[PDB]
Each structure stands twice: as C-alpha cells, then as structure tokens.
Amino acid sequence: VQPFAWQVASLADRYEESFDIGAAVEPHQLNGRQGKVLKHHYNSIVAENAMKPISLQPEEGVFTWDGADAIVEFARKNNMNLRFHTLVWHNQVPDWFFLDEEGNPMVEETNEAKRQANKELLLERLETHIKTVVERYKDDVTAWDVVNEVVDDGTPNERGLRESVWYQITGDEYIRVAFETARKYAGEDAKLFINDYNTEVTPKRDHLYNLVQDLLADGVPIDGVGHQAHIQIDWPTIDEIRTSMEMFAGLGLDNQVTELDVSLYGWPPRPAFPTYDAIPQERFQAQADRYNQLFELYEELDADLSSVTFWGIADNHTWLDDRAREYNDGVGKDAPFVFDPNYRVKPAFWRIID
Numbered sequence: 207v208q209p210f211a212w213q214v215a216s217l218a219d220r221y222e223e224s225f226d227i228g229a230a231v232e233p234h235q236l237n238g239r240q241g242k243v244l245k246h247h248y249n250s251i252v253a254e255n256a257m258k259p260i261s262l263q264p265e266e267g268v269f270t271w272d273g274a275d276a277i278v279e280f281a282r283k284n285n286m287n288l289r290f291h292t293l294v295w296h297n298q299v300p301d302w303f304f305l306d307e308e309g310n311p312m313v314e315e316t317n318e319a320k321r322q323a324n325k326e327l328l329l330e331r332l333e334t335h336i337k338t339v340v341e342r343y344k345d346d347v348t349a350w351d352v353v354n355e356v357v358d359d360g361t362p363n364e365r366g367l368r369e370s371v372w373y374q375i376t377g378d379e380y381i382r383v384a385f386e387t388a389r390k391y392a393g394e395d396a397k398l399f400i401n402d403y404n405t406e407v408t409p410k411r412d413h414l415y416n417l418v419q420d421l422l423a424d425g426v427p428i429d430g431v432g433h434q435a436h437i438q439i440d441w442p443t444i445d446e447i448r449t450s451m452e453m454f455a456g457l458g459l460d461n462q463v464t465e466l467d468v469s470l471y472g473w474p475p476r477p478a479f480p481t482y483d484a485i486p487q488e489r490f491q492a493q494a495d496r497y498n499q500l501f502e503l504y505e506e507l508d509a510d511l512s513s514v515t516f517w518g519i520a521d522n523h524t525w526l527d528d529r530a531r532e533y534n535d536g537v538g539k540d541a542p543f544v545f546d547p548n549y550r551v552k553p554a555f556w557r558i559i560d
C-alpha cells in the first residue's frame with residue numbers, strides 16, 4: 207500500500223530549476239483531495255475543457271465564463287502559472303462561427319466573391335473571440351495555445367495543413383490572424399504557442415516545422431511549440447522526442463509538454479483491461495521505466511523546455527478511458543499518471559522524483 211500523493215515529495219519543487227509541473231483540470235476538481243494534490247505537487251494548471259471555443263462563446267455574443275473564471279481564480283489564489291487552452295481548434299468550437307449571413311454553411315458557398323466575403327467574416331469573428339477572451343485573461347495566462355491541431359496527420363496538401371472548416375474557408379489565414387490578434391491584445395511579452403500531437407514523428411513533425419518556419423519568415427508572432435505528448439510506453443522513442451524539441455529550439459522557439467499521458471496500450475488501445483484492478487503490475491513497472499527515461503530526457507533538455515503538463519491529475523479521471531472504451535466494446539480502463547485512482551503514488555512517481 208503506497209502513501210498518498212500529498213505525503214510524498216512535491217513534483218513542482220523537485221523540478222523547479224527545470225520547468226513547471228502542471229495539470230489539466232475541470233472546475234469541479236478544485237477542492238477535496240484533487241485540490242489538495244494540485245496545491246502540493248503542481249505550479250501550473252490548464253483547463254481541460256472550460257476554455258475551448260464552444261465553452262466560452264456557445265452563441266455569438268453570449269459568453270459563459272464561470273467554469274473558466276473558477277479555474278483562473280484557483281490558479282491566482284494558489285500562485286500557479288496558467289496555460290490557456292485554446293483559442294483555435296476544429297473540435298468543441300461552436301457552429302455559428304461557420305454559417306454565412308444567410309445562415310448557411312460557408313463551405314457550401316460556390317460564388318468566389320461571396321466566399322471571399324465569408325472568409326473575411328470568419329476571420330472577423332475569430333478576431334472578436336480572441337480579443338474578448340485575451341482581454342479578460344491577459345494578466346493571468348502565462349502561456350497561450352493560440353491554435354490547436356492545425357497540422358494534418360497525413361499529406362492532403364503539400365503543406366500538410368489539416369483541412370478543417372477553418373482551412374477550407376481561410377486557408378492558413380486563420381492561423382496568422384489568431385497569432386497576430388493574440389499578440390495584439392496580450393502584449394509583446396505573452397507567450398504564444400502552436401499546439402499539436404505526434405509532433406515527434408514524420409511527416410507531421412516536418413510539416414509543423416515548415417509551417418512555423420514559413421510563418422516566422424512572414425513576421426507571424428509565434429513563441430513556442432506545444433507538444434501534447436499523448437504517447438505510449440514504447441512510442442514515440444526518446445530520440446524522436448529529443449530530435450523534435452531540438453529542432454524547434456533551433457528555430458529559437460520554446461518547447462512545452464502540454465497534455466502528457468502515458469497510456470498502457472498502443473493504438474488503437476486494444477485490448478484494454480476491463481477494470482483498474484485487472485491491470486498487472488508488470489504494466490505499471492513498464493510505465494515506470496518509461497517515465498524515468500522521459501523525465502531524464504526533459505531534464506536533459508530543460509534549457510529549451512519551460513513547462514510539462516499532464517492531461518489530468520490521477521488515474522481516476524482521464525480521457526484515455528473514453529478512447530479505451532470506444533475500441534473495446536464500451537469497457538476499458540487506462541492508467542496514465544503517477545497517481546492511482548485513490549491518489550496513492552505509483553511505481554512511476556518514485557522513478558521521476560529521485
């Protein structure tokens with residue numbers, strides 16, 4: 207029986223000379239045992255959902271800030287840095303953004319002139335969203351995920367840009383506007399990031415590398431790359447993770463691990479263990495070796511890595527479970543963190559605290 211998380215050495219303190227230790231949270235996890243764990247181990251947090259587009263302006267003009275404000279407040283009262291997730295994404299983004307003045311999907315428009323009109327209108331709506339949000343939180347956010355997942359997993363176009371509604375309507379323009387509007391209302395000292403997953407593997411990694419390089423050349427304000435790091439136990443490799451970070455550091459950009467979780471499974475996550483108790487210790491031990499190597503690496507690169515955030519706190523709450531269920535007929539459980547469902551340290555914790 208391992209001790210509780212609040213009884214062991216603080217992760218944030220152990221790495222205070224290298225980078226922040228953060229966690230993704232939901233408004234209802236800011237008290238109780240979770241709140242206790244957060245204050246004890248982390249010096250940074252991010253909203254798992256409360257700050258995505260659809261969560262802040264579900265209707266044009268109609269803003270909902272409660273969840274987001276609660277998270278911003280918690281971080282203020284506990285002196286923790288705060289990453290903002292996220293100003294632009296193709297998921298959890300309200301539909302009104304993409305309808306034309308007549309209420310029809312902009313993607314259905316065929317008149318070249320009217321399309322050019324809708325493009326300008328969308329960029330204007332994006333501009334307003336960013337402006338309203340950045341003004342309200344500019345003094346609390348310490349890192350902004352200006353855009354999320356704008357690079358494709360394959361190569362649908364020479365540039366490898368995800369062809370979401372944002373792209374179909376504005377090409378890469380929405381990306382430029384987002385960063386420039388963010389820099390405009392957040393101040394020249396706000397840290398602006400482009401966030402994505404699988405930033406360690408080619409071709410995606412190279413597409414992203416070319417995009418930032420191209421945007422940098424055009425004066426687009428981009429300060430760093432956010433690596434979600436939704437990785438596995440044996441993939442990607444340490445070398446691939448290292449190479450990617452070294453590559454972006456080479457462009458003079460900061461790196462941050464934003465949504466770290468180490469799944470016990472490959473991809474898709476099959477077969478997944480049905481319950482937590484059904485997971486064999488060998489798995490956790492393998493996960494522990496992975497974590498040791500991972501943080502040893504992050505420590506080796508702490509000169510170009512400023513923050514490391516887990517996409518959750520303890521194994522009782524993780525989006526990886528949804529993924530596990532989808533691929534295992536509705537039943538499955540993952541365990542990606544260093545703290546188990548009961549907030550008791552795991553083999554992994556010891557391996558990254560020493």
Ligand SMILES: O[C@@H]1[C@@H](O)[C@@H](O)OC[C@H]1O
Nearest residue numbers: 359404438441472473474
């Ligand atoms: O595309 C990825 C696949 O190649 C695998 O290895 O890891 C998860 C996926 O997201």
Ligand SMILES: O[C@@H]1[C@@H](O)[C@@H](O)OC[C@H]1O
Nearest residue numbers: 232254255523524525528
């Ligand atoms: O982990 C999150 C939780 O709030 C649940 O509802 O599933 C959705 C996820 O975003």
Ligand SMILES: [Mg+2]
Nearest residue numbers: 224508511512
């Ligand atoms: Mg650092």
Ligand SMILES: [Mg+2]
Nearest residue numbers: 498557558560
């Ligand atoms: Mg170690």
